[PDB]
Structure formats: structure tokens, C-alpha cells
Amino acid sequence: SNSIFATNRDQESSGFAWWAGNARLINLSGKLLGAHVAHAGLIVFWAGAMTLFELAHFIPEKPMYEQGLILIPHIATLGWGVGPGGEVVDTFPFFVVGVVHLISSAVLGFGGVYHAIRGPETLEEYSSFFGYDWKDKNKMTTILGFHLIVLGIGALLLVAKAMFFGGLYDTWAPGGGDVRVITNPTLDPRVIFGYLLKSPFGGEGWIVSVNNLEDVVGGHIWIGLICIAGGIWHILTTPFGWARRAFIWSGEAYLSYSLGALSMMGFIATCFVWFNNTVYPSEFYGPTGPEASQAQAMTFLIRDQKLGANVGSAQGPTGLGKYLMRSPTGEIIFGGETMRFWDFRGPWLEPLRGPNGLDLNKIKNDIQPWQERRAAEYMTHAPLGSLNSVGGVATEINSVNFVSPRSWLATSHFVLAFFFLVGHLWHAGRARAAAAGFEKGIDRESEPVLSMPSLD
Amino acid sequence: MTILFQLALAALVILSFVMVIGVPVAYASPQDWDRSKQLIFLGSGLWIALVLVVGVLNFFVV
Amino acid sequence: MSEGGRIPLWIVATVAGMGVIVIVGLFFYGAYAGLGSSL
Amino acid sequence: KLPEAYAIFDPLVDVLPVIPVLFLALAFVWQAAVGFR
């Protein structure tokens, strides 16, 4: 009664110290449900509260990327609130997204707190549907299937937005970036799955190279159907013998598999926001590193050519062209250190590119002021800056309060992906050792090495 | 109407703060659970209603 | 008066920690205002 | 900026994003109150 150890919420009952206390939940399906739903509330809370904070701080006439925004860029990329060139025409859609997430987080938090402290601690006595045993392989694949179906619907919501509810922001739209309705999504599997077999190295870039919204939307049509089909599959089947023999079947093992999965996705997202300027439009996120470096070469090409330079024939100090040179396969590219960035592609630059690379005739005659503007802007918003948000190279003096959203998003998600790989190793190794029965140490009376022949 | 709207949203903020403290306390309190359960229902229904009131009233000041 | 545990240690720790957070937060505020702000 | 009708709630909106951090801190207050048992 009046005893501190009288509950099962201590090391004495559970075998786990307070600093591993959430492991006490492994076999308490009800409270563990509470923990998960409450945690979902925290995610949704942040999405809502952070959007309202961003909107309250938002000056619509400054670029988003001058304002430390990462969520409003996500909403704008879906075509909400913006017009030609990414200009903000209406902030109310940002407000709605923020409010509805914040209100929804209250419902999730309510259910989480209920299940965590007031509801039934285990679900199995209460419901055969919601109860589960981690070692019940069929129940596990059924719950996986439910969530696969939910994820497929989610992918089809993006498609629905792109095709029937206003479209998406298209940085590549002919005549300038603009919101565009996608009517011909790419369904050809040779294109969609071709992305998955591209090398991740330079000039290829695996799926990070996706460069048009038709492929994006068609890809999500495929992922939607694949996930719904796989979900139906896993509700109607149980694991084959070869799978049963290959895997560890425990809650901690399943957690470890998902940690390895999320780590991989985190590293992928890091590269996506660093290199891709289609689903991360530079109008909202700022230029990529490659983009800003190319924009500097473009800027001084324009300036020096205006002064009378023949930029095609100008030999730089090394013997390579000061402004223009060849890639290792012959394409005409910008010179200087930005020779490394010749795989870059962006809508302000492509009008100057022909079958042989950069076209000297177009460079001499057809560079428009909006291209000079965009190159100057992007050169001066390169994703370089200090931890206290002093923009520029590390030797820059204080003045410009700037760190690119691309740098914030790349660094955070590398840090997170890395620790999640560590978590995968931790929990995968522990799940193996626990399934085999030696996660608490070596049995003194049955030490395996003592029964092995010496090595020499 | 602008003040009336501001009142309903203020009520929602205050009711929210009362629920944020009151619900976990009630859920983990031994005595008076019968009275607590009825109040949590009342607060929850009033909360939902105030969200709808603020949502509707939004379109008369924005 | 001198008996230990009249004021629960968990309250001592919580209030003391909040005090540390407040004072450190003040120092970070001062990095953006007044001397040392670059402004 | 928020729509002007909501402007009076600006200081509240400024502080809400940090609340998730408070939940991690709250776990330690709670654990201290049960003696880290």
C-alpha cells in the first residue's frame, strides 16, 4: 500500500533501471499504446506550433530563406499560398495548416495520456483485435499491413493535391516558376524504377536527381498502390519459412529494423535537401551549394563580358578558361573551382545550355536581367554560415543574419540519421543477445569459450 | 464582433490550460473519479465546441 | 528546523534547475543585446 | 504576421514551440518524485 516499490514501475519488478524505463513497456500493450499516441501528439504539436511561430515572424516581402523558415517552405512547395516566382499571395493557408495540426495534437495527447495512465495497462484481456503478442508473427504482419495501407493513402493524398486540388509549385514551369496542375504523371515503370537503379555518384544521384513534377507525382502513384497492395498482402499472409529462419522475432528486434530504416531515410533526406532544387525549390529554401557556386561564376561572367571581355577565349592563370572550360567528357561548363559543380541544373541557367553544354552565342546575346538578378541573389545567399547564424564564409565579419534552410535541414537530419544508425546497432545487437539468452552476461558455470579448443 | 471573437478564443486558451493540468491529475487520482469523469466529459465537449466557435467566428474578423 | 527531508529533494532539484536555466537563458539573451551583440 | 485579429496572442505563439522540450524535462521531475525507483 504505502510502499514506494509496491507498483510494477520500478527496477525491482521490471528488471530495468529508470534510465531504461521505457523498456518496462515492452509487454504492456495498453500503456505502450499510450506512449506512442502521446508521442504522435508531440510531433503534431510541433508541426502546428512551429508553423504559427513561423507565420507570426514572417515578413512576406523578404525571401523565406532569409527568415529561418523550414515549415512554410514545405507548405508553399505544395502550391498553397504562393504565385509566380514563389511570391506569397496569401498567408491564410499557412495559418490553417498550423491551427489544424495544433488542434489535432490535443486529441492525440488526450488519447495518449488516457491510454498511458488511466486505460487498461495490457490490451489482450480487453480485446483480441487490439491486443498483440510480439512473437505472434501473423498479428505482427497484420498491424504492419494496416499501417502500410495508411501510408499508401498518404502518398495518394500528394497525388490528389498535385492533380485535382490546385497542383504543386513548379520551379521548372515554362516562363518562370509557378504553381502548376500535374495532368500527365509519369506511369512508365522504366522511368519510375529507373531512378532506383541509378548510381548515387556524381552526375547520376540516384533518386535525388528527380527533376520534374511528373516523375514525382507518378512515383507517388506507384508507391501508393505498392503500399496498399503490400498491406493487403500482409493482412492475408504470414511469414514464409525462409523469413521465419532469417529474422529475430521480438519487439526490440522489430524496433531495431525500423531504426535502421529511419536512419537510411534520414541520410537520404539530407542529400535531397542539399542537392535537389525541384521538390526543395530554391525560391523557398535558398540556392543549393552547387547552385550558389555556379551563380558566382555566372555573375562575374556577366559583369566582365559587359566590360568587354571575350569570355570564351579568356585563358585563366592555370591555362584552363577563366570563365568557361570543358568537363572531362567535353561539355562546356563554368570555370574556376565550380568545375566540380557542372552537374548542377536550375531554371535560371538552363536557357543558356545547349546540346554541347553552355552555349557561347546564348551567353553573349541572351542573358536576361532576371537571370543576372537571380545569379547575384543566389551567389549572395550561398548555404554557408556560422552556428550563431552569421552569414558568409567563416572569415566574414558580423552583419548578415543568415544560415540557409538547406544547411539547417541537412545538418539536423545527418545528426539524427547517424544516432539512429547507432540505435539500430545497439538494439539489433541486444535483440540478438536477448533472443539467445545472454544479454545479461556470460553464465559462469557454462562459459562457451571455456568449451572451445584454444586457438594455439 | 472582434472582441467577442477574442473572448471565445481566450476562453478556449483558459479552458485548455485547465484541462492540461486537470486531466492528468484526475486520471491518476484515487478519489472522486466519478465526479472527475463527468467533468472531463464536460470540459472535452466544451473544448470541442469552442474550437468550432472560434473556427466559425474567424471568418467574421479575418 | 535542521531535520533532513522536510523540503523534498525532488522539489529542490526542480527549482534549482529552473534557476540554472533562467540564468543561462539570460546570458544567451545578452549575446544578442548590448555589449558583445556586434550591433 | 498572424491575422490581425489574433495579434494579441502573438507572445503566446512565440513560446509554444518549446513546449515539447518541457515534456522531456517533465519526465525527470516525475522520476525524481518517485525516487528514480
Partner: peptide
Amino acid sequence: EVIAQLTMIAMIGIAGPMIIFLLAVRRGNL
């Protein structure tokens, strides 16, 4: 704006420990 901000975060910040304290005195299910 700064007096309002500090008051909000003070009321929000006390709420958490206030829940623990109220349950501790009531000998609740901590």
C-alpha cells in the same frame, strides 16, 4: 511583448511540475 512572453512561459513552465506536485500530495498514481 517581452513581459507577456515571460509570463506565458512562466505559467506554461509551472504547469508540468504543478501536476507532479498535486499528485504527490494527493498520493496519486505517480
